[PDB]
Design a protein around this ligand. Structure first.
Ligand SMILES: [Ca+2]
Ligand SMILES: [Ca+2]
Ligand SMILES: [Ca+2]
Ligand SMILES: [Ca+2]
Lengths: 154, 154
């Protein structure tokens, strides 16, 4: 846990301490500690960044498939379940270990709630894009989602 | 009508004839003429490009607003109605004039169906991004949606 280097490593980029902390701040932790900013805005941003990147890739990889099919192939790659699994294996400990959660949420399995893991994954993508820009975020995403992509066709 | 320069001008970039034609190809025209490729894939792509750009802008312009609010501000800028109006005033003739439509769709008001205009607008953004890349598409979009954005806050 504690050390975030194995995480900054999985990601492949570097993130200032404050931004990475915000990215890992689930709302529960935020409320329990006096109304701290949450990773929700970052999640919102990361969702659009991930959405375009996966859309762009599928568009190029399947020139002959229809919008509808493309929409179906995308849904395979970015659903809550698929995102959470990327967080769970992002690094040895997994992402769950690094998420800041409230007492309640904490002992209720919070650190493994796919829901929370998916949101968290999106927040990080959001932070990366904010700190570095589209192309770097693109790289990182093509790497973490490189497999789930090849899988989508089936 | 016919000449697409006033359009390539409004857009502010240049697009190869074939790509611009595809972008303007509504499915009706496509079916009526033997099963031509449609602007639907381009629309799908343009939607994600527009989505990230507007998300990114609102994120920066309102640092203190919550995800929920941000989601509400975005919906103002990218709804069917808002998109169609951008197409109608994109250029003198408007976009409707340049869309390729089938006989049926044509005389049923097709060229003014906000639905068709919105999709068309998204297809062009899709073509621009495909031809030039994210930053140029970003520019173009920040320009066409520059107003609707300032409006969103109210
Ligand atoms: Ca949520
Ligand atoms: Ca989300
Ligand atoms: Ca449609
Ligand atoms: Ca659409």
């Amino acid at each position: 846990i504690r050390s975030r280097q194995p995480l900054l490593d999985a990601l492949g980029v570097d993130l200032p301490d404050e931004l990475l902390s915000l990215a890992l701040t689930h709302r529960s932790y935020a409320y329990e500690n006096g109304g701290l900013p949450t990773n929700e805005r970052l999640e919102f941003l990361g969702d659009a960044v991930l959405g375009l990147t996966i859309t762009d890739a599928l568009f190029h990889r399947h020139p002959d498939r229809s919008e509808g099919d493309l929409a179906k192939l995308r849904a395979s790659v970015v659903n809550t379940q698929a995102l959470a699994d990327v967080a769970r294996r992002l690094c040895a400990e997994g992402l769950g270990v690094h998420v800041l959660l409230g007492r309640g949420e904490a002992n209720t399995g919070g650190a493994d709630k796919s829901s929370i893991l998916a949101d968290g994954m999106e927040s990080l993508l959001g932070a990366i894009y904010l700190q570095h820009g589209m192309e770097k975020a693109r790289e990182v995403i093509l790497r973490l989602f490189g497999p789930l992509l090849d899988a989508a066709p089936t």
